Symmetry: D2
Subunit: 257 residues, 4 copies
Amino acid sequence: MKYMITSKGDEKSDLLRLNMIAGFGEYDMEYDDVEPEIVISIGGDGTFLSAFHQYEERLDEIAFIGIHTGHLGFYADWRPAEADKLVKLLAKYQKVSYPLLKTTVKYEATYLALNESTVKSSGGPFVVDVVINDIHFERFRGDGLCMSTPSGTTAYNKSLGGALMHPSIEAMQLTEMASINNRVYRTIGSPLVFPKHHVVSLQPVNDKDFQISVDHLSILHRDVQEIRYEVSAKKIHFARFRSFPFWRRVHDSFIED
Amino acid sequence: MKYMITSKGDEKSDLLRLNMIAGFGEYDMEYDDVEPEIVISIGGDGTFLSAFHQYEERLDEIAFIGIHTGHLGFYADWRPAEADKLVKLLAKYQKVSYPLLKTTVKYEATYLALNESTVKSSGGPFVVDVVINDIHFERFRGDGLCMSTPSGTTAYNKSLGGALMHPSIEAMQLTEMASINNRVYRTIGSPLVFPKHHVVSLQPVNDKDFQISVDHLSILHRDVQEIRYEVSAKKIHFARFRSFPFWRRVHDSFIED
Amino acid sequence: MKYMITSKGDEKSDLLRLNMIAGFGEYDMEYDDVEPEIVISIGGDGTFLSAFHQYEERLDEIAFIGIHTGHLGFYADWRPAEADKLVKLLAKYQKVSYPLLKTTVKYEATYLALNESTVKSSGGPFVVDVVINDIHFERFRGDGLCMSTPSGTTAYNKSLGGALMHPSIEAMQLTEMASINNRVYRTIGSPLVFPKHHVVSLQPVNDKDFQISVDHLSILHRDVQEIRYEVSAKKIHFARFRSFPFWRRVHDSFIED
Amino acid sequence: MKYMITSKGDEKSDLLRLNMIAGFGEYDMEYDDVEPEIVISIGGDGTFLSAFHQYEERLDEIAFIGIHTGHLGFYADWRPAEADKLVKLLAKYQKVSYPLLKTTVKYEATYLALNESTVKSSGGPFVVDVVINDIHFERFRGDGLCMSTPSGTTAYNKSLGGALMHPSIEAMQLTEMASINNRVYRTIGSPLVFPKHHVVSLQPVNDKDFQISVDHLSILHRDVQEIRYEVSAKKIHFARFRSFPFWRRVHDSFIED
Ligand SMILES: CN(CC#Cc1nc2c(N)ncnc2[nH]1)C[C@H]1O[C@@H](n2cnc3c(N)ncnc32)[C@H](O)[C@@H]1O
Ligand SMILES: CN(CC#Cc1nc2c(N)ncnc2[nH]1)C[C@H]1O[C@@H](n2cnc3c(N)ncnc32)[C@H](O)[C@@H]1O
Ligand SMILES: CN(CC#Cc1nc2c(N)ncnc2[nH]1)C[C@H]1O[C@@H](n2cnc3c(N)ncnc32)[C@H](O)[C@@H]1O
Ligand SMILES: CN(CC#Cc1nc2c(N)ncnc2[nH]1)C[C@H]1O[C@@H](n2cnc3c(N)ncnc32)[C@H](O)[C@@H]1O
């Protein structure tokens, strides 16, 4: 089938990429970066995120694979030494799917996030009303908010005090960035975990300009009327070759390897 | 059908209980506290928890209802003024189910928790190995651990920094109590959210005596070899009469009412 | 003696300012906004912060006073109804002094902060080496860092998890903003409280552009070689007329009033 | 002068203790465990804490020294290889003093803490009114409270989210253990740092039995009317032989060594 390989760009990743293309050439495998069925990322989790967004319009037809040439990643979770075994088994596997986060920006534009989407103010203070399923929940004032996917909970969400969720749970998690809490403003404080079909809506109070991020991309959006978050109906599909449990991936990354 | 009413014991709850029994008497309703189909709790969330554990052997055949005579509760979420309307509609509704936590103590004994189950040391230091699906995850040293149900996340879990999960998500959440983290002991720190069929196992390192709690009940268990946590196959069934969304219940309890 | 009054600008503050000037005119008091001995702020804590920085070059010769026309402030801690009594007693008091934070930016420029000084990245990732008294302490990667004065601990420092310090303690407190902590980057996590004469130095790793804030002012600094923090030798002097203990000010602002 | 050596009890500590006594015998040094001027602890920080409380009645006349036979401690901060050099220099140094915490239990009894003093309930719920300098600050409900010395901030205080304070600051820090915060109970949440002469008083609401700890000692106190915390007028004196800065001790223990 058709495949493509993206590289971090350094010497180690480019050389491993050319070795895998050479190995794939020994099989009935066609290199195609327009309509591939297999997308292999060689580098780090950031390289994988770029590979994800490069082909986010054909997610239903692609199985992703991440190879880490540096430290272990949560998406790039295979070592370079296993690359030849990867080529062989790719040539002849199972698939697993992770949930995604859909962000809607109304002035509308839509985006998919594999890790998270965050909102911060343009320059002045950040004040938004948080609406959950069309009911006003809180008026947040602080540095910003972060809405994370399950596989994203080990990233920005973790540094903000959020919980780590197993990626088989179809949910999204909202966490706060340095909220003010006194006799005036009151926020929930705790991270919030929302199931599928729940819609979390951010609405401006005064300033309507916001710095909105989706994974690595960050854009200053002007004249924003609303930001809608919900668990996406689309999922990202990984090629699975052996058992690397998520909790073991957490242990190896944060406890010790 | 058969019903029973439990009371907090104070004058307000006992008087409301006798008024509801009198109202139920005007219908084809039989008071029975042995095999009831309807269990009404009048008091607080603690009164509801006692009502839950009193009939935990017939959960599949009971619809629970909570009336709060004090402040709003997450289980006792109906005001005394609605009691007469409750009697009428009970006489002729829909049902909603929340997940439960199964705790297994091997020396074995099993328990169901509606809020959470916690483990603390008998007297000396608390050290346990945390095993997730038969793989060693961390060696925890600290004050204790708390495993929460979704509806329990707004209780002890919240005070420990855990996330608030909508009760439609079949999961359990583990949080830490004052863990040591230095060049010796290392814990994950973040709360962990586990899906159904995941088994979290606590195993002793030196001391084998532990103070184990399940909701309000707390027992000193001796010669403990293992404590197993998993999302229960059983669920608690609530009688539903109108929409009181969980997130609104969170807003009314923690933001303002 | 000479005095001046600054106003938030709204109708309530301007009208109270003109009433106090009229009351001061009934005494031997000279309005002077060039070399005043008394600086009265009417508005909120933000109005007071602007009054502080307007006269930061004559701190040793000025007694500050804050009047809150909205909610209680930690610097604007006197109600408008007490303004006439303030005029009388000003005309004939004691003084109390709070510590300040000195920030040095080397490319050098120096700044005084009454609340705090923060460092965030220009656009990309924020990575700095933290040096305490000329010894490397940690390599911080995250959103930013905040160094707070004692009276500033109830402001940005509090939202970041820092401790509240009584302003009689000559110290500064450093807190983290969403730090990464895994098998690569390692930060202390806890807030750090430094005494007088301790020098905390932030040094760039790759990017040398930083968004540096001092109280309300925020400047993008380019080609930064170092940022030095230390407890200032200067202090801000408040005119004291009665006992409003700091801990009571904390209770009234955060517990209830 | 007179000296004594306490040992953890294991083979390594006892053997090092006998070697130091033999080395001290080659000088005009008298072993005395009744009225020593030098108290050497060989083991861990726990061994040092026991050595501190064994001679807490002669703190003004004793210089303490800690040797760690295991991992580095904050009080036992000298390696066994330096023991012979310690004997020589002891025979002929400077002294440094750390602040202590005085706990008063009224039914009265007084205690000194080098690390911290904590309060937890006897069995039921823990509810106390927190009084700061004779003014009611908050009604705390939760697992307990911890009042830490500066050198104690790296111990229990750190695991509870408190700040790390340099031990030259004469202060005490109060932190919360899992407090309830809703529309009923309200606590400050943040750690509180109190200067000298400030008195923090814990007063019972219903239950008058409390589990009170001071460093390693923990006693169930009955019929408690009040618990008073204040920075002690006494200090612990360490023998200083070279520079091991506190912040370096923090870096070596928590960042890496
Ligand atoms: C760095 N870029 C490529 C990547 C990655 C990645 N993904 C994961 C994952 N899923 N699990 C464990 N590690 C991971 N690394 C963009 C990502 O930087 C993260 N980020 C931004 N600011 C952060 C902060 N202050 N603290 C922690 N993280 C932060 C955001 O998550 C953003 O997406
Ligand atoms: C008090 N008893 C009856 C009840 C209740 C209740 N349940 C909920 C709920 N689900 N959501 C919102 N409020 C709720 N209250 C037993 C419960 O006391 C909670 N608990 C114990 N120590 C705690 C602490 N340090 N901090 C917060 N909570 C604590 C444990 O959760 C235990 O189950
Ligand atoms: C708002 N401006 C005028 C003021 C004030 C003020 N000072 C105090 C005080 N000392 N104590 C109690 N309340 C106070 N309000 C500038 C201040 O906004 C604060 N800030 C910025 N971002 C924040 C965040 N994410 N969370 C909390 N605070 C934040 C920074 O502290 C900055 O200095
Ligand atoms: C273990 N025993 C001897 C010792 C010591 C020690 N002192 C220091 C110090 N000053 N700095 C850095 N490490 C230190 N270790 C009693 C001490 O156990 C600490 N502790 C109790 N429960 C804890 C928890 N849940 N989390 C962290 N700590 C806890 C209490 O602090 C108590 O005093």
